[PDB]
Amino acid sequence: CPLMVKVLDAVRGSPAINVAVHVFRKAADDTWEPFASGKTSESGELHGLTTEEEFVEGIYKVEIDTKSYWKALGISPFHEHAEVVFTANDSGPRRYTIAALLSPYSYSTTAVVTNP
């Protein structure tokens, strides 16, 4: 699949499991249209979100529900979620892995982009 998300927990040193992830694509009206969604696995990974055919060029938004994750763990986090916004496939099909590292009051996100 061309879009993968990987989430890690910096407090426990483990993959962030069952984290809700919603992806949106900017429409002509500049509004965010639902594109795909899923939950991270036991390895903190989410695959099968889309296909090369469906994943056309556009501006995408990957919203990771970090809040529900921390609350489920008995922690009141700072952020509502982690949002990664980017232009995808504007120079041909690419493979994207959006990685996120979570902490109650902090998060980092990196993008690994390779050719198909």
Added chain:
Amino acid sequence: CPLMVKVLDAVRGSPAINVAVHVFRKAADDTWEPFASGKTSESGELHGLTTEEEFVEGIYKVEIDTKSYWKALGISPFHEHAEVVFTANDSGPRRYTIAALLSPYSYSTTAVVTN
């Protein structure tokens, strides 16, 4: 000023100067409404965004224009911008410092809430 933003450049190891920052407050209509904005100083900081009496509880979004920042440096960036969405509560501490560390294909943000 109960809300401050600090941005750093991880490629050049310096404060990220002249980065546009927009703050929004979630309205009852669930839409985002402009609240405050400015550009980071020579030290990569942005203060005087709001006042204690205007900064009421609610959900705020701090949008940092990282794409323009990198493009002015002649560097190809991945993200359109960096967005930090959070609920400001009177329960916890008073001052909110939103810090961001920038790289072309990566960014981290941390909140320092003190009294």
Added chain:
Amino acid sequence: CPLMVKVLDAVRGSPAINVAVHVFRKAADDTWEPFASGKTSESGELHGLTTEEEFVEGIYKVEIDTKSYWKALGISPFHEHAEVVFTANDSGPRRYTIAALLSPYSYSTTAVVTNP
């Protein structure tokens, strides 16, 4: 293998390839004895550093040569290397993945520790 290292390049959004990695283990004399070494692959990964039998409890140091990596790229980095020091296997055998994200003047490192 019980010890894996993964390195990513935050400037190019790609795995950090051919990065030299040296691992050391603290001896009785508190000196660092060479334990294992390798280079990251095209996926920015390094496996086969050791075995569950050789990877006994102790204090280990994983030194990632970030300097040679950036210099080879025509960049004069700030750090000499990235050093991750930790106690391993003190409560039984564990699997460790030391992940590092590199930038010329910054790096972050996270540890993912799972059971065998």
Added chain:
Amino acid sequence: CPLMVKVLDAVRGSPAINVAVHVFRKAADDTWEPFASGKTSESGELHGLTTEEEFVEGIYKVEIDTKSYWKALGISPFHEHAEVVFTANDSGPRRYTIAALLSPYSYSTTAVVTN
């Protein structure tokens, strides 16, 4: 003070207070020799480590005792400490700020070199 250290706590979203910091300078014997040390203040900062005339070019190691920091908070940490090794050059800018963001199983460090 040409060398400053700033430490933040990513779990509690606050400055990391009272963290022991040791600085070392590489001697010709390749061994590490004590140079300066102290503990972060209430704002998580450590200044007055050295002076411009004592801070000559060379390889320095800034060792942050993160393990003790977490243990005092009753949190199990992964790292023994955080070590930042770098060469100080007169060529580039004057002031060196070593910033570190701490989490129990993760830490990031950034260098802000300014004039």
